[PDB]
Structures are given as C-alpha cells and as structure tokens.
Design a binder for this molecule. Structure first.
Ligand SMILES: CCCCCCNc1ccc2ncc(C(=O)NC)c(Nc3ccccc3)c2c1
Length: 154
C-alpha cells in the first residue's frame, strides 16, 4: 500500500527554486515540484511533467537523489516519493493559481515555512548526497518518528 510520487528540486550553485503552494494539502508552505505518477508513465517522465505543470520549467537533465516514504497517521496509503535534482532548466518560472515559484539563496532556505522533514534531508541534497528516508507524521506539523540514511544508489 504505497502510491508513487515524484518531487523535483531545481538546485543551482547558489540558489534553489521552491514553490509556495496556494491550495489544498500543504498550502502555505514552500514545496519542491511534484505529484502523482500516472498510468503507463515512467517515474522520470512523471518528474519532468510535474516540474512543467507546477513551475512552468522544462528540464533538460534530471538525476535521482533520494526516495522518501511518508506515512500519515489515519491515512492508509503510504506516499513513495522519488526525489530528483537538476541544475539545467529552460524557461522562466511561472506563477499560477496553484503555485508561486521563488528563488532562495542557499543560506536563506525558509525551513520554518516548509514541511518539517525538509530540515533533515536538505543538508544532504545541498551536498550532492543521495538518501533513503521514512517519516511518520501526525497531521501536517508533527514528525512522530523517522529514519534517514545516505546511499550510493537511490
Ligand atoms: C499530489 C501531491 C500531493 C501533495 C503531497 C503532500 N505530502 C507531502 C508530505 C511531506 C512533504 N515533505 C516535503 C515536501 C517538499 O516539497 N520538500 C521540499 C513535500 N512536497 C511534495 C510535493 C508534491 C509531491 C510530493 C511531495 C511533501 C509533501
């Protein structure tokens, strides 16, 4: 009982792109760009699609950086999130009714206004490490338990 998702971080040498989510689950937080993988779609194709749908950017090159499983108490389905990173994009970020993309300098990442798990795995992302994570949440604010380990292959 896990559902496949993707999550894309646009990480350049001095800045990262995040999107403020305007509606529904995780509204009011800065997010990477992601969503559910579709029937007959590869995980990487889904990641590329989600980046365009949510940011307006076209990815030229993607690489795998992690897998994170999320459990929410009272929710039967686990979220199996495949995380990707790129430095190489085309287009300019687009604000839509759903998302407002903004660049952040790396020492100004707005963790207080991000999912709480990000504090744990962003240090690894920023140093080009790969990882496997598991986070058990109660509601959107509380991590009950987690695991996080660096890996050589995602
Ligand atoms: C169709 C997707 C429904 C929204 C998923 C809400 N659950 C959830 C739980 C914990 C999370 N922790 C971190 C982040 C993140 O962006 N860190 C930079 C999350 N963003 C995320 C956005 C889309 C798909 C998958 C993950 C995230 C999302």
């Amino acid at each position: 009982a896990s559902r496949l998702y993707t999550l894309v971080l646009v990480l350049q040498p001095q800045r990262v792109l995040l999107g403020m989510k305007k509606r529904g689950f995780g509204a009011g937080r800065w997010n990477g760009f992601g969503g559910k993988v579709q029937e007959g779609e590869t995980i990487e194709d889904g990641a590329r699609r989600e980046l365009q749908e949510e940011s307006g950017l076209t990815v030229d090159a993607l690489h795998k950086v992690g897998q994170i499983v999320f459990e929410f108490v009272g929710e039967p389905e686990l979220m199996d999130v495949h995380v990707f990173c790129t430095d190489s994009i085309q287009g300019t970020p687009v604000e839509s009714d759903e998302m407002r993309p903004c660049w952040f300098q790396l020492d100004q990442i707005p963790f207080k206004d991000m999912w709480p798990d990000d504090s744990y795995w962003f240090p690894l992302l920023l140093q080009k490490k790969k990882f496997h994570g598991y986070f058990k949440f109660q509601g959107q604010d509380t991590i009950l338990d987690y695991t996080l380990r660096e890996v050589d292959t995602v």
